Design a protein around this ligand. Structure first.
Ligand SMILES: *[C@@H]1O[C@H](CO)[C@@H](O)[C@H](O)[C@H]1NC(C)=O
Length: 547
């Protein structure tokens, strides 16, 4: 069948119907529907007022204003709040009451576009494969990124989180209109990776999404990740106002200035210092969400209450840290480059600055227990990847599933570990899954563009698409429109069970206790060490001028 012209809160919308077989199977595809009005620089989004007549939603609109790679603070403009929809259709009748999956893209909160772009190893986000292979409606949209989406003074002058408001507006529009297209409003599921994985998390915790989200999936990213929350907003708020001529040490005037400063200037003033220097950096992504007064009204760890009736999946790739540690210690497969013990200590120190050399010393100690030694420079390099994977993805993720499992009411909880080896020619033979390697499988690339894909890739992709969509349908990965390769057991604090996802999907894919001892170190021992919180009175309550 064909949807045709659908009437939504704003007016009529028309997309294209792509035929997929000689038997009626088609797929309606709408692109460019506005969920909000063109946002004003550093200002929250308003609902879109509507339009007269029909909207021809046939192509992705401008992605949000962001920087290219080197110069160009160009990639879109402020008018970018658009969403796209993919509705699988039969032949007999039109689809109705279908699960809805809203995708939130990553890109370190600084880059990103619904139009399958702004990402590295993988980037295209076409919902056709998922929609059609799982009989699910797939949605994608744009949310403000960069200074323009997350710049904040840390007070009423500039709260920040504008990018999170946009994501919320999308989710809201979908809640209110998705039935027009054949979706079931009470079966909205969110999924995302990296910053998108964290956004999904933060969106389930926000009181604003009280009863909008039914289920959620976070991939390589969660709200408790050290990188998801900016502890000291003003810090970079001043520095930005430094590059662009604005009254730095006067929040009010500074905020007024910025809000009127040129978007492209504001965008560009933020250049990631990925250069030739080893000072603690290369993971100082200043523009990320913050704890403001309302959207994220407290530390994410205390907001769990909001996600108690939300079915949740959270997972990690066995070497998520590889991509990042490489930027610090550029020894991937550099056989003619060796990592010394002090090299490891040096990385540790930088990673544990807030706890002094005591923290650095405890960490180095726990992490260097194994006897593979110098001779096994592989093991050394191996542990350096474990370290950043644990710190940036795994630990935060374990705490989030446990936390969710314990405070769950009716919600289900499932976690996973994706380990399909990266066959990137420029990485060492020991490589497992790196950050983002999951994307191609989740979005069904091995099927969409099979050229260059082994069958194993189609095996994995068939499984992941099956798990995600079954879950999006029943809250259970093992029950839905598709056949699951191996049973995925619901999480328990008792077993700490995780499905290892790869080509060998069988009864033995369900495993227990992934790096329990390190969870312990980071959460008990380490945490107990005195912090260099030492900031005098530069603490959250003192000297914030009553917000
Ligand atoms: C470890 O760090 C502590 C200070 O936190 C210091 O007293 C000790 O000498 C250090 N030991 C080594 C072996 O580096």
């Amino acid at each position: 069948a064909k949807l045709g012209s659908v009437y939504t809160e704003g007016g009529f919308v028309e997309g294209v119907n792509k035929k997929l077989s000689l038997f009626g199977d088609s797929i309606d595809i709408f692109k460019g529907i506005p969920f909000a009005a063109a946002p004003k620089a550093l200002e929250k989004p308003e609902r879109h007022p509507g339009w007269q007549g029909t909207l021809k939603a046939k192509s992705f609109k401008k992605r949000c204003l962001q920087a290219t790679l080197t110069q160009d603070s160009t990639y879109g403009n402020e008018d970018c709040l658009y969403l796209n929809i993919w509705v699988p259709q039969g032949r007999k009748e039109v689809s109705h009451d279908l699960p809805v999956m809203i995708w939130i893209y990553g890109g370190a909160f600084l880059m990103g576009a619904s139009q399958g772009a702004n990402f590295l190893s993988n980037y295209l986000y076409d919902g056709e494969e998922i929609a059609t292979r799982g009989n699910v409606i797939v949605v994608t949209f744009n949310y403000r990124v960069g200074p323009l989406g997350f710049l904040s003074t840390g007070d009423s002058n500039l709260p920040g989180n504008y990018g999170l408001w946009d994501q919320h507006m999308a989710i809201a529009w979908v809640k209110r209109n998705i039935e027009a297209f054949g979706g079931d409003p009470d079966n909205i599921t969110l999924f995302g990776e990296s910053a998108g994985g964290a956004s999904v998390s933060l969106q389930t915790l926000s009181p604003y999404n009280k009863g909008l989200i039914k289920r959620a999936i976070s991939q390589s990213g969660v709200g408790l990740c050290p990188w998801a929350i900016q502890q000291d907003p003003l810090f970079w708020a001043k520095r930005i106002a430094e590059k662009v001529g604005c009254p730095v040490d006067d929040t009010s005037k500074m905020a007024g200035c910025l809000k009127i400063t040129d978007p492209r200037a504001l965008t560009l003033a933020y250049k990631l210092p990925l250069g030739s220097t080893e000072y603690p950096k290369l993971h100082y992504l200043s523009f990320v969400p913050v704890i403001d007064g309302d959207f994220i009204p407290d530390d994410p760890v205390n907001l769990y209450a909001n996600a108690a009736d939300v079915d949740y999946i959270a997972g990690t790739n066995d070497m998520d840290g590889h991509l990042f540690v490489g930027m610090d210690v550029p020894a991937i497969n550099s056989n003619k480059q060796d990592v010394t013990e002090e090299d490891f200590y040096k990385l540790v120190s930088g990673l544990t600055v807030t706890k002094g050399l005591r923290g650095a010393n405890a960490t180095y100690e726990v992490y260097t227990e194994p006897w593979a030694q110098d001779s096994s420079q592989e093991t050394r390099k191996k542990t350096m990847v474990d370290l950043e994977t644990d710190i940036l993805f795994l630990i935060p993720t374990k705490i989030a599933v446990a936390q969710h499992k314990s405070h769950a009411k009716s919600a289900n909880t499932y976690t996973y570990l994706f380990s399909q080896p990266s066959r990137m020619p420029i990485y060492p033979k020991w490589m497992g899954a790196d950050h983002a390697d999951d994307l191609q499988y989740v979005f069904g690339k091995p099927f969409a563009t099979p050229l260059g894909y082994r069958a194993q890739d189609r095996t994995v992709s068939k499984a992941m698409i099956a798990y995600w969509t079954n879950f999006a349908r029943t809250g259970d990965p093992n029950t839905g429109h598709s056949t699951v390769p191996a049973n995925w057991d619901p999480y328990t604090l008792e077993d700490d069970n995780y499905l290892e996802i790869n080509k060998q999907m069988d009864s033995n894919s369900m495993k227990l206790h992934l790096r329990t001892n390190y969870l312990q170190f980071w959460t008990q021992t380490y945490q107990a060490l005195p912090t260099v919180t030492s900031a005098g009175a530069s603490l959250l309550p003192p000297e914030d001028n009553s917000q």
